[PDB]
Amino acid sequence: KTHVQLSLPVLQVRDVLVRGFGDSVEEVLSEARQHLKDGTCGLVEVEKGVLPQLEQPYVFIKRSDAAPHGHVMVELVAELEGIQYGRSGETLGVLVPHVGEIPVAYRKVLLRK
Known about the structure:
Blueprint: E1 3-10, H1 25-38, E2 41-44, E3 58-63, E4 72-80, E5 83-85, E6 91-97, E7 105-112
Parallel strand pairs: 4-7
Antiparallel strand pairs: 1-7, 2-6, 3-4, 3-6, 4-5
PDB class: viral protein
Keywords: fragment screen, KIT library, viral protein
Assembly: monomeric
């Protein structure tokens, strides 16, 4: 399927144990997609002071359209030293590995895969 319904655990930035997906734009997009497929991907909501507490390159989920069955359609955009790889809508948050952190909420998304 071109899209997959996912429910992403929303993590507090100070709880996150693994603060990024790797060391290159291509690696972090690769790893983010693998973790999204494996159900091992968390979401951190972006506010003042969040991104400097995480590791670049960043992987964002961004709204790709204006929401089937409650799931917002999203796609992945990576960022490294202020350059983004991808073009999409509003940021819903930054993706990180999930390794058992307790979430504060869930974000229902339809991921363009």
